[PDB]
Write a protein that binds this ligand. Structure first.
Ligand SMILES: O=C1[C@@H](O)[C@H](O)C[C@](O)(C(=O)O)[C@@H]1Cc1c(F)c(F)c(F)c(F)c1F
Ligand SMILES: O=C1[C@@H](O)[C@H](O)C[C@](O)(C(=O)O)[C@@H]1Cc1c(F)c(F)c(F)c(F)c1F
Ligand SMILES: O=C1[C@@H](O)[C@H](O)C[C@](O)(C(=O)O)[C@@H]1Cc1c(F)c(F)c(F)c(F)c1F
Ligand SMILES: O=C(O)c1ccc(O)c(O)c1Cc1c(F)c(F)c(F)c(F)c1F
Ligand SMILES: [Cl-]
Ligand SMILES: [Cl-]
Ligand code: NA
Lengths: 140, 143
């Protein structure tokens, strides 16, 4: 069966493509969802791509990915340097966790120390590169 | 076509020989071939070089700066320890992608941080040797 991958975007990402397109790119979150779904499907993956500004909703999704042993690509957005609850929930995942940021945040994520790996600064392509890693490192 | 420089620092010459259970069984020589194959596939040329010498790495980075070529850099044992390397990289006009095989944020970061991360285009850590191939894909799509 095709590998289910959850792609979770946190606060601010709802404004992707609308807010500061000269910094984070012109692609909207809707277009990002479609691009990720297409590329995942090409790789034999099923991407479940969601955005929320609610910490509670993000935790809720992470908990389901934990129980289901499904990989997660997480861009915590505005919660990246603030939510300990996200860190704590992600610590319970039993499949890979790839943290992704569009911009190079380094120019102290709670998530990075507990993620499998991290991709930052590579734009929206970072999500696609994370998919390609998972396609090669998680089996069906 | 585009020429990409992959530069590997100290320790990376022992890839596949040192702690293969941690960094993988693929040797640096085999990594070169994997990178070369992927660059052929993507329509890029890749030059892959490794040295344990900081001075040698600085020379290669200065040369990439003068040539205006992109750099994929795994500073290896110099990651947390060479300001000079960062200064050299600051003069690169083409993209700079930092790659680490291991997730450096998980293993040994208490005080110390990568010097390169703030000035890199982007960073890939923890994705194993595939991280190099992923960085190549980024470069192919971006010039
Ligand atoms: O929401 C954020 C920032 O709070 C975070 O520090 C970086 C971040 O996670 C990233 O580079 O992916 C993301 C950056 C960011 C924004 F900061 C923002 F305001 C947006 F509208 C947006 F689409 C966007 F991607
Ligand atoms: O929370 C859920 C599921 O319980 C529901 O069946 C679908 C659902 O509401 C949706 O497609 O938006 C959502 C699916 C879902 C998950 F099931 C999940 F494990 C995630 F990690 C996740 F990000 C995600 F979006
Ligand atoms: O040389 C290093 C470490 O000194 C560095 O902290 C991380 C590092 O840059 C990375 O994960 O890519 C690299 C890790 C590492 C090693 F630490 C090492 F001893 C090797 F033989 C090796 F091949 C290797 F990749
Ligand atoms: O918030 C805490 O201090 C804490 C204390 C005791 C615990 O058993 C515990 O799990 C936490 C919360 C916590 C994590 F869940 C976790 F995954 C961490 F990496 C962490 F540092 C942490 F501290
Ligand atoms: Cl890609
Ligand atoms: Cl790949
Ligand atoms: Na495609």
């Amino acid at each position: 069966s095709e590998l289910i991958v959850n792609v979770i975007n946190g606060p601010n990402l709802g404004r992707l493509g609308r807010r500061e397109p000269a910094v984070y790119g012109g692609t909207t979150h809707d277009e990002l969802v479609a691009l990720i779904e297409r590329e995942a499907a090409e790789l034999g993956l099923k991407a479940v791509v969601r955005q929320s500004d609610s910490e509670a909703q993000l935790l809720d999704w992470i908990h389901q990915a934990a129980d289901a042993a499904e990989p997660v690509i997480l861009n915590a957005g505005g919660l990246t340097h603030t939510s300990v609850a996200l860190r704590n929930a992600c610590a319970e995942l039993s499949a890979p966790l790839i943290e992704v940021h569009i911009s190079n945040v380094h120019a102290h994520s709670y998530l990075s120390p507990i993620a499998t790996g991290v991709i930052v600064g590579l734009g929206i392509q970072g999500y696609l590169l994370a998919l390609r890693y998972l396609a090669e490192h998680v089996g069906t």
